[PDB]
Design a protein around this ligand. Structure first.
Ligand SMILES: N[C@@H](Cc1ccccc1)C(=O)O
Ligand SMILES: [Co+2]
Ligand SMILES: [Co+2]
Length: 277
């Protein structure tokens, strides 16, 4: 049997822009159970993350006044985010067209899936939800270097799309925004949103001998496959957000064409030039 998925169920009776896929955050659809699920997730992650998340992430939660006890009101958070870095968040139904996603980032708008997983799905949801998108991704938007990296990434979508290279950018996003690590004198820390919202990938990614921790290298990353339904086999480690921003400022066009004819690395491979940490 085919049954409707969670995105379809949650969005019953609601609409989205056929173009930019933005809707007003539907506050009246959050049930008491939803605010409780949020509070449970928020509490779980805030217990787990000290000494694991990078300091900028934890300070962003506080500076943005991300609610501990209910799903946040996006308008309220936006007042703080706008004053910090001129960003805002926009509600979307769930996954959106790539060109829309890029155009949002290019214009300093971060798309956030509005709805929340059900309490039976507390431990893990495959689809992004509001907890993953808001709690995992938004705190670092108050950091001006990281926010400029996202805007720059957004602006690159047009060139990538024109050259059939969106998957090569998607790999860079996955291995930075979603699953990145950042080294510090106090030890390795986490900045990827997919780790920061996870029940236990923050533990594996720092504590396990199993994954590879490889120094960031733009061409390697854009030539590396990833999988979405398993802990990462490789994490890429930056030294600073200023590195994402700088390492990723050259013209990507000749890089895409060189990659377009290469065979990519598997998700668990170690490449001959990898600085392995
Ligand atoms: N420098 C990239 C744009 C980009 C910036 C930052 C991250 C990813 C892509 C280009 O030439 O298109
Ligand atoms: Co639709
Ligand atoms: Co994400």
């Amino acid at each position: 049997f085919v049954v409707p998925d969670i995105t379809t169920r949650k969005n019953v009776g609601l609409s989205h822009d056929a173009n930019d896929f933005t809707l007003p955050q539907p506050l009246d659809r959050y049930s008491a159970e939803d605010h409780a699920t949020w509070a449970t997730l928020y509490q779980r992650q805030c217990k787990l993350l000290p000494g694991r998340a990078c300091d900028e992430f934890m300070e962003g939660l506080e500076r943005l006044e991300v609610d501990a006890d209910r799903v946040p009101d996006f308008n309220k958070l936006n007042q703080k985010l706008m004053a910090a870095t001129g960003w805002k968040i926009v509600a979307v139904p769930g996954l959106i067209p790539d060109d829309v996603f890029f155009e949002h980032l290019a214009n300093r708008r971060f798309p956030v899936t509005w709805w929340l997983r059900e309490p039976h799905q507390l431990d893990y949801l495959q689809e992004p939800d509001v907890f993953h998108d808001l709690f995992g991704h938004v705190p670092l938007l108050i950091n001006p270097v990281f926010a400029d990296y996202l805007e720059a990434y957004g602006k690159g979508g047009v060139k990538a799309k024109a050259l059939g290279a969106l998957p090569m950018l998607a790999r860079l996003y996955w291995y930075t925004v979603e699953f990145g690590l950042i080294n510090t004198p106090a030890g390795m820390r986490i900045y990827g949103a997919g780790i920061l919202s996870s029940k236990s990938e923050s533990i594996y990614c720092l504590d396990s001998a199993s994954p590879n921790r490889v120094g960031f290298d733009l061409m390697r990353i854009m030539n590396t496959r990833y999988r979405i339904d398993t802990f990462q086999k490789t994490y890429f480690v930056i030294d600073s957000f200023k590195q994402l921003f700088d390492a990723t400022a050259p013209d990507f066009a000749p890089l895409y064409l060189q990659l377009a004819d290469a065979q990519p690395w598997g998700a668990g491979d170690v490449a001959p030039d990898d600085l392995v940490l």
